[PDB]
Amino acid sequence: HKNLTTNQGVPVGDNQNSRTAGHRGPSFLDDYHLIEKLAHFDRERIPERVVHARGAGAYGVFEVENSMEKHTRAAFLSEEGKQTDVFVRFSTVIHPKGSPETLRDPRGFAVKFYTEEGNYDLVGNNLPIFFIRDALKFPDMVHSLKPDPVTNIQDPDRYWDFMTLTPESTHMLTWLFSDEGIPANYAEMRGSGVHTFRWVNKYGETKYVKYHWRPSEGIRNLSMEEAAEIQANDFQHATRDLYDRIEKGNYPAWDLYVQLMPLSDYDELDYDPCDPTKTWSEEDYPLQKVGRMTLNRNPENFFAETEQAAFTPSALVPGIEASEDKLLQGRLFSYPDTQRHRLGANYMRIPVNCPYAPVHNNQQDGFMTTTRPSGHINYEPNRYDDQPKENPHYKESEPVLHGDRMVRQKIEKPNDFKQAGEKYRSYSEEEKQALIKNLTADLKGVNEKTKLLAICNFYRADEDYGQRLADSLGVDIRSY
Amino acid sequence: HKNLTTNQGVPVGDNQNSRTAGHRGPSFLDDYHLIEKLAHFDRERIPERVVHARGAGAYGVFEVENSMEKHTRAAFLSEEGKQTDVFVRFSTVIHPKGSPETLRDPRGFAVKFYTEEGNYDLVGNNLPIFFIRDALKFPDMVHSLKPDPVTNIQDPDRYWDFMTLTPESTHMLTWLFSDEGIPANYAEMRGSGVHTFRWVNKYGETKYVKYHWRPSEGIRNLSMEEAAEIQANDFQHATRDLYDRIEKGNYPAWDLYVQLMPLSDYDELDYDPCDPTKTWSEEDYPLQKVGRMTLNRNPENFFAETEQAAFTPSALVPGIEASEDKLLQGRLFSYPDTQRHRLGANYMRIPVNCPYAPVHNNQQDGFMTTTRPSGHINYEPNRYDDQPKENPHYKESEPVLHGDRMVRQKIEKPNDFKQAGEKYRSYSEEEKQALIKNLTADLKGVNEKTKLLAICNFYRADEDYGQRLADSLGVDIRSY
Amino acid sequence: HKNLTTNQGVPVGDNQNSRTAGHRGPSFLDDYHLIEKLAHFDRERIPERVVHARGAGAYGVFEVENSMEKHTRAAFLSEEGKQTDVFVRFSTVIHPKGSPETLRDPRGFAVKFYTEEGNYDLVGNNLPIFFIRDALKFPDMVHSLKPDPVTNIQDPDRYWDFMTLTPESTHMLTWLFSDEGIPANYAEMRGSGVHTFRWVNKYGETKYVKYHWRPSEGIRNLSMEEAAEIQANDFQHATRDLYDRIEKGNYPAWDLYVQLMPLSDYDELDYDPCDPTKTWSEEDYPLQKVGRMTLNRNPENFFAETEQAAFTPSALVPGIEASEDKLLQGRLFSYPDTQRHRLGANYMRIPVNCPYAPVHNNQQDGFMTTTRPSGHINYEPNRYDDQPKENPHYKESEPVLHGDRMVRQKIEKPNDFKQAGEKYRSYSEEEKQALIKNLTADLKGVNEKTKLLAICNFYRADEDYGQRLADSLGVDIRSY
Amino acid sequence: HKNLTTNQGVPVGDNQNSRTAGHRGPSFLDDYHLIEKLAHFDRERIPERVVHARGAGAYGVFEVENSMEKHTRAAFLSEEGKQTDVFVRFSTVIHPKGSPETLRDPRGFAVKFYTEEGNYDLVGNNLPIFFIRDALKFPDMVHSLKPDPVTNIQDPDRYWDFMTLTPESTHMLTWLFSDEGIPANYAEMRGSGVHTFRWVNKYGETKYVKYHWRPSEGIRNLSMEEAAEIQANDFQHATRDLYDRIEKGNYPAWDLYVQLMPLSDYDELDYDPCDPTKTWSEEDYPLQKVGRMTLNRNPENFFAETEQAAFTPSALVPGIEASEDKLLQGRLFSYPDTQRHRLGANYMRIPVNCPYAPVHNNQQDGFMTTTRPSGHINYEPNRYDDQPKENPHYKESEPVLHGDRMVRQKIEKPNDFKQAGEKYRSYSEEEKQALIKNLTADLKGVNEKTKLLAICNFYRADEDYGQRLADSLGVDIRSY
Ligand code: HEM
Ligand code: HEM
Ligand SMILES: [Cl-]
Ligand SMILES: [Cl-]
Ligand SMILES: [Cl-]
Ligand SMILES: [Cl-]
Ligand SMILES: [Cl-]
Ligand SMILES: [Cl-]
Ligand code: NA
Ligand code: NA
């Protein structure tokens, strides 16, 4: 047995009645319990994530099968058998916190590894490419996909406007409007790092790397009609499914694979290997197994752990570095920036975000300082040998720069249509049919000039793709 | 034609490419446009409302048909034909932004009248009673109804635990589990002030009042299966319907009716007229027509106007006062409290929240001061005749107190079951069948002791009600 | 030895150089250490206290000498020898955080007692009365005293305007413009609860109480000229002195005394005993020794402990209750209200604010949830015997109300001048001269009508007082 | 005459008395005016600036005397006679709001020019160099100079520790410890841009530039004894002086001069011309007159205009660009970053911060959206010709990069001591005496090892300088 108390630690005598002028009179201001309890209630909510607002989290373990020390000095990958705790959040993208998990969207696949040399965040999605290749466009892209700012309803005319005029999107759309646009749940789902990263070994040698997560539960997708039928009765079915698997002891897992490419292959290719609208051939750059992640524990409190979880692509660890991918570059900034707003200056002290590795630095203060700071020395350099010092063993690599000027200029070899055609042609006939069906349902109401431009983009990917879509939309494209 | 600019007013030379080391290198910190645009994007979201997070707004006009000056000095009600502008937000209650509008819930019905003596907010719901009668219980009620804090899924076993142990909820639950728990949309829906308020006339005479809104479009509800059919294909169907009606010129309207009761009728009733778990008889206190509200304009920007709208039951105008209702009393505090957090100290300067009536006072400063303040005098009393002064014509009434001590104690005559039985018996056979069906579906998985207590509460309301529910649940109540 | 790390726990290779395009080129975005370190720096500050911004804190112990159980059930006062930990902040009032401690002002004397039945805050000042007697006036008062909102400089013409038109201020001003308006430092200083409170014993019997702190170091003040001499060379002399005393083991101490008055003495007096512009006679209501507080430890971090400390007059413990004093009644609200803005919704989790007593309740979430919450049950009533429950042993008293209506009306027997005259007459001739000197320096530049009203208010206190001030100001009051 | 009103626009009947249970009873919760008024009071304060918290602002006009079109295409400098409105804030650096203006510190000299092509901020200080040359060190530098995080008192042992170990500081200290470390006020004070910037003309040709402001009132400084004398009687003498000059029509003015250097001069100098610890010889790069700024108008509200004013070095206009200076580079980030925290995401809508030039972009929402947004299109590219578009006439230059690799490495030719010696030797004998006096008073209580290192640093600047300091400190440096 325990007393109900105020936040001052005073036991509460009555948690049923406000203090009033007799049993039926108006309420008095001197009711600390009422005021404190209402005021805290009044302040429960914090801003939702600007994208990926809807999601679900779980803890688990990653275990190395094949050590990667020949390619990366990353401590958590250094030895067979080595286990690292993780926290993972899965999500949709566009709609708000309470929105259904049956909508078409990429799914987020955000892993925080609690390594002995710091937290490593790999902030992936299920689909392995993106719509755009420069972060400057992200707010535009998002605003086009988001509910209309007048009506609060998503409008395909808006996002198809932006996407058609951003033809690098063509490959992504070709995946998003397959039925993999609606994964059956979070467990039966791919994961991808999307970007190329740099792995740097103890000798300072660099490779390009791509990450891939392969579900032990297999990949399964929903048709539009299957998604609708689930939506009718459950708007949180993927959150449900994840919690339930774990509660039952049926732990979902993914095998981690990487591809590795020499920096010097840039000139051997007809696309930029750091363009995130591109994949790398699995034939030319085969998948190499690293290990397995198993999710085996639900959080204790959804708000404190899942809703307040903060992941950033810039939470890198020694031996793993950003590539020059311009989309990735902006992310390095935007996540910690949004997290300071959403969660507070000290969000890194929220338990789920805390490293296992020691934190020692000269940062101080900020809202909600709860860590019991002490000491006179909050600056470096200083004269004290016992105060924290830099450690040059942990310097990052020095990538070579090929440019001689500060420029704003698109990459060379953008090659916006080729891989979209290759993906189209890789689909089974059933999959192609589902693609055309999903695209047609989405495009049929949009502005005619935009609709034509969409058809033309997919035609450039593959003539059959474009012609089928034109036919299904009742657009005559003879004349182009 | 317009230039795209930064917030500094500098025209943007390139809104496509980040600034980089050559055409494919890493990104530079000196890209003010990139950083300003990402940083503002990163800060678009603010906290959703703690309850009623999902909703939709519209503007319109209220016109008086019968002047109410005999009963209230309220300026906006003073004469036939008088028109006052309104803003109205409709909502669900429990689930977040983005959640479907097909869920079972009260609906919010919040009206802001822009009067010549200040803004008057009548912050209603569709249903005319509430689950509880003291604001001290509101965070408890809400937390039981809200998604489980571990699973993020709503759990009937949790809110039924609370409700069964809070038998004053029995009347409300008898309305909420009729099909009126799922209105067809926001236009074909009842509105209620719920609480008794006080109307005070120019002679200082007070009457108790209840407000009622009657839809010109009729009341229409959804069965569970009708709601599921809509939910399959649209999770924002009520927001859609409202916008579309107005955009088409098919303006929805509601007639405003009041009931009026002498203060002296308290003592002879077998309930407390200021208990918000009670209605008043429409035979004994007939509905009296006041006027009509027509909604005829969608907002220009959903965030700025609908999301940032702030209503409070304490936004009262001369001639309309709070009653002693202990649930109302807390609301008077909680709304402007939460709004300071959700919207900022200066939320009353956000355009939708601004009065039409002049605002002059000695308040100052606060986050986001945008009003161009001036003058040396921000204190009263002062020696300056031209500075704002109090006006004793606008004093509120002096309600009589019946109590002689500061107490925490339940009202007399709580009478938790009688009106629930009267409501049950007023249902058609089809409506009773739907009630029992909706209750059974909700209760069938809850803890057996809780399920029994629920049955017993509805049995006390009406023996046929309780026995039918026991039967439908397969629960043997013989030994009770 | 320790590595300097990021907040992710990654050791920092170089804490001297930003990452750049060669050794002299512009800076890259991909510099997580730079951006994290600057972004946290950029957010170090929180709002200062709206008043009492400048202050200093220390920890100590309070020890009971005479148990008070005959008069109050307060646990921390229950036994001779009983020790309770404290945290104390001393302060000036009007000017901002970095302002000098040599200015004229009341001094704050805020004591947080970490009791076994919760935190008790006695939020006092040095001077034993106040300017005003209703919280509605506090923003006005403060705005008049604060730097002019145009010039950022305090103007006596502004606060004398207010004070002269608020004649209840006369007693306070008679103490404030003695040399006790500038204490020599925070150790050689009086402390007062100011308000009357209610003490309730285990039988439910109530007495009125007044609290007084008497410094072991004696009371010592500065003249205007002595204060200027200190200010020339140190603008934080009192903060310095407190820290230095404690660091060198010269712990400052205060003896706590109370006065006790029956509720039934209200009619026996020519002032309202809950008017905080009044003191109680030490002859008629003798000082009774309670115990001693010794301050013996400086904080480890000033921001985390002193700057983030939150005290409230509403942090009452069983056996100690508010009186009806209308100034105190507003304070009960204002302190936790401002603290939620200044410090966050979860400010009660910041270590210095945490109780020693257990905290268990159903509150949740809010910015910066750092406490590792768990469990499914966040609502009461509930079916679970082990969850926290109310404890009726801890109900507060039920004060009798003498009013029969809700009114806005000044107290009876305001008696604004009598005690001011008594205080004036209690001064030595030297002290009277210092009072007249200090008043004259302050009033000599103000508006002539205001200056005459000030003279008239002090005349009504005592004719000699008024006449001396009129003489010193060159104002002829013979015509009146 | 005006009514005092609530923020709802309801006239207030009584601004003196809270609502209570009879004339002396406790206070009621149903007192919207009391609560609204206390709650806004409770929220008046925002965080102070992390540095330069103490300051004062004024408006004025800048007039071009000599067009600068040979060297920059900046619109505001394009024609003789062209007038641009400005807002200017002057400040100290280290201590909080409220702190004295008689302390040793650089002073801030921040000018916002409201140009036809956007707001241009030149965020200067009086002294023309800085302590450090990389932004990564700024929080360290500041934390060393700030009050000790334990004692809340500035400690020379702390900042001398940092500075001695940061020998690039030697030139700055040789200025700061002249009497120019304490300007007499803000009007009789130098201004400097400190950094090298880039000026780009209509042909795309670039020069390096430095900015200098020369007071029409002449430069005047305070000795330590003069500063103490002012501090005794006034802790805000500079804020007072600036206001008072303007109020009386004695407008202070500064002439703007520039120095111009070819980019190609880098390679021939024995220092880096973008090292902000360095000045450029006025013999080799003569001062060239641009125009004059006159400050002629005080703000109407200090909080809304001066306290909320936001300047950034990244508020550049066409023809004026950042240089590669690594200290400047980090400022480009830090200012808008802190401002979003201190002021809100929408701080650029606060009136003092608004451009005169039109703002049109696709940003949206954020706390306190007051600007009445409208329209369906908040994304680019889009199909609408009338929506805002990029304008390639306004592209910035493409600076050449001399580096091969992303590196963390000190600039070449740091040359930490030469210019410090030159400055020393340029002082009059009186000025050298004052320098040594001021240094000696600061260093005499510092740790011996630190004190010796300081002496050594100044000795390397100039043997006489170091030896005089050592002699004054009683340190025998013969052995070295
Ligand atoms: C320039 C491109 C992008 C920008 C600017 C961007 C920005 C953001 C921001 C601001 C958030 C909210 C973060 C938070 O509140 O902590 C977010 C969430 C997220 N984004 Fe992105 N994003 C971009 C591209 C991508 C890409 C390529 C992926 C996947 C490869 C991705 C996956 C995610 C995921 C999974 C989340 C949710 C993380 C979580 O579960 O907590 N985004 N993004
Ligand atoms: C990396 C070096 C520096 C950093 C990181 C930095 C950072 C900051 C920050 C965060 C502020 C607060 C701004 C606000 O809240 O609006 C500030 C204020 C200021 N700093 Fe710096 N600063 C640096 C160097 C300098 C330099 C070299 C100068 C002058 C040349 C300078 C002059 C100022 C001034 C004048 C202000 C006051 C602006 C105002 O009146 O609002 N700072 N600094
Ligand atoms: Cl922020
Ligand atoms: Cl650090
Ligand atoms: Cl006011
Ligand atoms: Cl708040
Ligand atoms: Cl609670
Ligand atoms: Cl934009
Ligand atoms: Na009439
Ligand atoms: Na005793």
Coordinates of all heavy atoms in Angstrom, one line a residue, chain D residues 210-243:
Chain D
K210 N 37.5 45.3 -44.2 CA 37.3 45.5 -42.8 C 36.5 46.8 -42.6 O 36.7 47.8 -43.3 CB 38.6 45.5 -42.1 CG 39.1 44.1 -41.8 CD 40.3 44.1 -40.9 CE 40.9 42.6 -40.7 NZ 40.1 41.7 -39.9
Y211 N 35.6 46.8 -41.6 CA 34.8 47.9 -41.2 C 35.2 48.6 -39.9 O 35.6 47.9 -39.0 CB 33.4 47.5 -41.0 CG 32.6 47.0 -42.2 CD1 32.4 45.6 -42.3 CD2 32.0 47.8 -43.1 CE1 31.7 45.1 -43.4 CE2 31.2 47.3 -44.1 CZ 31.1 45.9 -44.3 OH 30.2 45.4 -45.2
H212 N 35.1 49.9 -39.9 CA 35.5 50.7 -38.7 C 34.5 51.8 -38.5 O 34.2 52.5 -39.5 CB 36.9 51.3 -38.9 CG 38.0 50.4 -39.2 ND1 38.6 49.7 -38.2 CD2 38.5 49.8 -40.3 CE1 39.5 48.8 -38.7 NE2 39.4 48.9 -40.0
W213 N 34.0 51.9 -37.3 CA 33.1 53.1 -36.9 C 33.9 54.1 -36.1 O 34.5 53.7 -35.0 CB 32.0 52.6 -36.1 CG 31.0 51.7 -36.8 CD1 30.8 50.4 -36.6 CD2 29.9 52.1 -37.7 NE1 29.7 49.9 -37.3 CE2 29.2 50.9 -38.0 CE3 29.5 53.3 -38.3 CZ2 28.1 50.9 -38.9 CZ3 28.5 53.3 -39.2 CH2 27.7 52.1 -39.4
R214 N 33.9 55.4 -36.4 CA 34.6 56.4 -35.7 C 33.6 57.4 -35.1 O 32.8 58.0 -35.9 CB 35.6 57.2 -36.6 CG 36.9 56.4 -36.6 CD 37.8 56.8 -37.8 NE 38.0 58.2 -38.0 CZ 38.8 58.7 -39.0 NH1 39.5 57.8 -39.8 NH2 39.0 60.0 -39.1
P215 N 33.6 57.5 -33.8 CA 32.6 58.3 -33.1 C 32.8 59.8 -33.4 O 33.9 60.3 -33.2 CB 32.8 58.0 -31.7 CG 34.2 57.6 -31.6 CD 34.5 56.9 -32.9
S216 N 31.7 60.5 -33.7 CA 31.7 61.9 -33.8 C 32.1 62.5 -32.5 O 32.6 63.6 -32.4 CB 30.4 62.5 -34.3 OG 29.3 62.2 -33.4
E217 N 31.7 61.8 -31.4 CA 31.9 62.3 -30.0 C 33.3 62.0 -29.5 O 33.6 62.4 -28.3 CB 30.9 61.7 -29.1 CG 29.4 62.1 -29.4 CD 29.1 63.5 -29.2 OE1 29.8 64.2 -28.4 OE2 28.1 64.0 -29.8
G218 N 34.2 61.4 -30.4 CA 35.5 61.0 -29.9 C 35.5 59.8 -29.0 O 34.5 59.4 -28.5
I219 N 36.7 59.1 -28.9 CA 36.8 58.0 -28.1 C 37.2 58.4 -26.7 O 38.2 59.1 -26.5 CB 37.9 57.0 -28.6 CG1 37.4 56.4 -29.9 CG2 38.4 56.0 -27.6 CD1 38.4 55.7 -30.8
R220 N 36.5 58.1 -25.6 CA 36.9 58.3 -24.3 C 36.7 57.1 -23.4 O 35.7 56.4 -23.5 CB 36.1 59.4 -23.7 CG 36.7 59.9 -22.4 CD 36.1 61.3 -22.1 NE 35.6 60.9 -20.7 CZ 34.4 60.8 -20.3 NH1 33.3 61.0 -20.9 NH2 34.4 60.5 -19.0
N221 N 37.7 56.9 -22.5 CA 37.8 55.7 -21.6 C 37.8 56.0 -20.2 O 38.0 57.2 -19.8 CB 39.1 55.0 -22.0 CG 39.1 54.7 -23.5 OD1 40.2 54.7 -24.2 ND2 38.1 54.2 -24.1
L222 N 37.6 55.0 -19.3 CA 37.7 55.2 -17.9 C 38.8 54.4 -17.3 O 39.0 53.2 -17.7 CB 36.4 54.7 -17.3 CG 35.1 55.2 -17.8 CD1 33.9 54.7 -17.1 CD2 35.1 56.8 -17.6
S223 N 39.6 55.1 -16.5 CA 40.5 54.4 -15.6 C 39.7 53.5 -14.6 O 38.5 53.6 -14.5 CB 41.3 55.4 -14.8 OG 40.5 56.1 -13.9
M224 N 40.4 52.5 -14.0 CA 39.7 51.7 -13.0 C 39.1 52.6 -11.9 O 38.0 52.3 -11.4 CB 40.7 50.7 -12.3 CG 41.2 49.7 -13.3 SD 42.3 48.4 -12.6 CE 43.8 49.3 -12.1
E225 N 39.8 53.6 -11.5 CA 39.3 54.5 -10.4 C 38.1 55.3 -10.9 O 37.1 55.5 -10.2 CB 40.4 55.4 -9.8 CG 41.7 55.5 -10.5 CD 42.5 54.3 -10.8 OE1 42.9 53.4 -9.9 OE2 42.9 54.1 -11.9
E226 N 38.1 55.8 -12.2 CA 37.0 56.5 -12.7 C 35.7 55.6 -12.8 O 34.6 56.0 -12.5 CB 37.2 57.1 -14.0 CG 38.2 58.3 -14.0 CD 38.5 58.8 -15.4 OE1 38.9 58.0 -16.3 OE2 38.4 60.0 -15.7
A227 N 36.0 54.3 -13.2 CA 34.9 53.4 -13.4 C 34.3 53.1 -12.0 O 33.0 53.0 -11.9 CB 35.4 52.1 -14.0
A228 N 35.1 52.9 -11.0 CA 34.5 52.7 -9.6 C 33.7 53.8 -9.1 O 32.7 53.7 -8.5 CB 35.7 52.4 -8.6
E229 N 34.2 55.0 -9.4 CA 33.4 56.3 -9.0 C 32.0 56.3 -9.7 O 31.0 56.6 -9.0 CB 34.2 57.5 -9.4 CG 33.6 58.8 -8.9 CD 32.4 59.4 -9.6 OE1 32.3 59.1 -10.8 OE2 31.6 60.1 -8.9
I230 N 31.9 56.0 -11.0 CA 30.6 55.9 -11.6 C 29.8 54.8 -11.0 O 28.6 55.0 -10.7 CB 30.8 55.8 -13.2 CG1 31.4 57.1 -13.7 CG2 29.5 55.6 -13.8 CD1 32.0 57.0 -15.0
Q231 N 30.4 53.6 -10.8 CA 29.7 52.4 -10.3 C 29.0 52.6 -9.0 O 27.9 52.1 -8.8 CB 30.6 51.2 -10.3 CG 29.9 49.9 -10.1 CD 30.8 48.7 -10.2 OE1 31.4 48.5 -11.3 NE2 31.0 47.9 -9.2
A232 N 29.6 53.5 -8.2 CA 29.1 53.8 -6.9 C 27.7 54.4 -7.0 O 26.9 54.2 -6.1 CB 30.0 54.8 -6.1
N233 N 27.4 55.2 -8.0 CA 26.2 56.0 -8.1 C 25.3 55.5 -9.1 O 24.1 56.0 -9.2 CB 26.5 57.5 -8.3 CG 27.7 58.1 -7.5 OD1 28.7 58.5 -8.0 ND2 27.5 58.1 -6.2
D234 N 25.8 54.7 -10.1 CA 24.9 54.3 -11.2 C 25.4 53.1 -11.9 O 26.6 53.0 -12.4 CB 24.9 55.5 -12.2 CG 23.8 55.3 -13.3 OD1 23.0 54.3 -13.3 OD2 23.6 56.3 -14.0
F235 N 24.6 52.0 -11.9 CA 25.0 50.8 -12.5 C 24.5 50.7 -14.0 O 24.6 49.6 -14.6 CB 24.6 49.6 -11.6 CG 23.1 49.4 -11.4 CD1 22.4 48.5 -12.2 CD2 22.5 50.1 -10.4 CE1 21.0 48.4 -12.0 CE2 21.1 50.0 -10.2 CZ 20.4 49.1 -11.0
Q236 N 23.9 51.8 -14.5 CA 23.4 51.7 -15.8 C 23.7 53.0 -16.6 O 22.9 53.5 -17.3 CB 21.8 51.6 -15.7 CG 21.6 51.1 -14.3 CD 20.4 51.7 -13.7 OE1 20.4 52.7 -12.9 NE2 19.3 51.0 -13.9
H237 N 24.9 53.6 -16.4 CA 25.2 54.9 -16.8 C 25.2 55.1 -18.3 O 24.9 56.1 -18.8 CB 26.4 55.4 -16.1 CG 27.7 54.9 -16.8 ND1 28.2 53.6 -16.7 CD2 28.4 55.5 -17.8 CE1 29.3 53.5 -17.5 NE2 29.4 54.6 -18.1
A238 N 25.6 54.0 -19.0 CA 25.7 54.0 -20.4 C 24.3 53.9 -21.0 O 24.1 54.7 -22.0 CB 26.6 53.0 -20.9
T239 N 23.4 53.1 -20.5 CA 22.1 53.0 -21.0 C 21.4 54.4 -20.8 O 20.8 55.0 -21.7 CB 21.3 52.0 -20.2 OG1 21.7 50.7 -20.7 CG2 19.8 52.1 -20.5
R240 N 21.7 55.0 -19.7 CA 21.1 56.3 -19.3 C 21.6 57.4 -20.3 O 20.8 58.2 -20.8 CB 21.5 56.7 -17.9 CG 20.8 58.0 -17.4 CD 21.4 58.5 -16.1 NE 21.3 57.5 -15.0 CZ 20.3 57.3 -14.2 NH1 19.2 58.0 -14.3 NH2 20.4 56.3 -13.3
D241 N 22.9 57.4 -20.5 CA 23.5 58.4 -21.3 C 23.0 58.4 -22.7 O 22.8 59.4 -23.3 CB 25.0 58.1 -21.3 CG 25.9 59.0 -22.2 OD1 26.2 60.2 -21.9 OD2 26.1 58.5 -23.3
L242 N 22.9 57.2 -23.3 CA 22.5 57.1 -24.7 C 21.0 57.6 -24.8 O 20.7 58.4 -25.7 CB 22.6 55.6 -25.2 CG 22.1 55.4 -26.6 CD1 22.9 56.1 -27.6 CD2 22.1 53.9 -26.9
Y243 N 20.1 57.2 -23.9 CA 18.8 57.6 -23.9 C 18.7 59.1 -23.9 O 18.0 59.8 -24.6 CB 18.0 57.0 -22.8 CG 16.5 57.2 -22.9 CD1 15.6 56.4 -23.5 CD2 16.0 58.4 -22.3 CE1 14.3 56.6 -23.6 CE2 14.6 58.6 -22.4 CZ 13.8 57.7 -23.0 OH 12.5 57.9 -23.2

